[PDB]
């Protein structure tokens, strides 16, 4: 590869998506990992690890933030308004579970915008079938966080999921795929520059999208109860 005008426009597209990633979402991964690790910021979160800790601590919001970020993707607002709703209808759950891995470690998940922290084992100890609600998300997060993506990687990765040309009921598929092809080019370059150690990380990220649709499929089956 070389540093040429096409490469610079892909990096400028990456920077634009990252700035919108920050403006649209309050709690990013960089601040999430800082809270979960030692370099914590302000007030420490209230850990909920059993029933007693639940008492002394006693999705709709994310849908609005993701739509705000989708409006900043170049060309998304110019699509047919019905297709814009269709892309966000079948993709918002895949985004939320991707953002959820940023707030997760092997012990639990960050809740209440970092004010609380509920452990993984306490969520599994809940009564059936509520004990199986968050467990598929943790198993995905352990594998997903093993890729060690940052906010710059996730910003473009979130954009590729939105511009999925295979959503049911898309009136105009071709212009959607032309944007995703541009997003895929920027995501490939972003991963090669930011991850000199991960062989075929671009291929591994695309395979994670198949795992995301299996979570949403499994989550809807759990919601029919």
């Amino acid at each position: 590869m070389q540093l040429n005008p096409e490469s610079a426009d892909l990096r400028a597209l990456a920077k634009h998506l990252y700035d919108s990633y920050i403006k649209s979402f309050p709690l990013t991964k960089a601040k999430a990992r800082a809270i979960l690790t030692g370099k914590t910021t302000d007030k420490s979160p209230f850990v909920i690890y059993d029933m007693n800790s639940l008492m002394m601590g006693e999705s709709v919001e994310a849908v609005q933030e993701i739509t705000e970020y989708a409006k900043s993707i170049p060309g998304f607002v110019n699509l047919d308004l019905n297709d814009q709703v269709t892309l966000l209808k079948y993709g918002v759950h895949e985004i939320i579970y991707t953002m959820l891995a940023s707030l997760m470690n092997k012990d639990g998940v960050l809740i209440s915008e970092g004010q609380g922290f509920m452990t993984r084992e306490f969520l599994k100890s809940l009564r059936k079938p509520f004990g199986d609600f968050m467990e598929p998300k943790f198993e995905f997060a352990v594998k997903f966080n093993a890729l060690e993506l940052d906010d710059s990687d996730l910003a473009i990765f979130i954009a590729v999921i939105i511009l999925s040309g295979d959503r049911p009921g898309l009136l105009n598929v071709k212009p959607i795929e032309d944007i995703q092809d541009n997003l895929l080019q920027a995501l490939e370059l972003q991963l090669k520059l930011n991850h000199p150690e991960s062989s075929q990380l671009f291929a591994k990220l695309l395979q994670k999208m198949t795992d995301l649709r299996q979570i949403v499929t499994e989550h809807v089956q759990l919601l029919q109860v």
Partner: peptide
């Protein structure tokens, strides 16, 4: 909800 999406646009 699709109704929440068909609003922020």
């Amino acid at each position: 909800l699709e109704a929440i999406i068909r609003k922020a646009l």
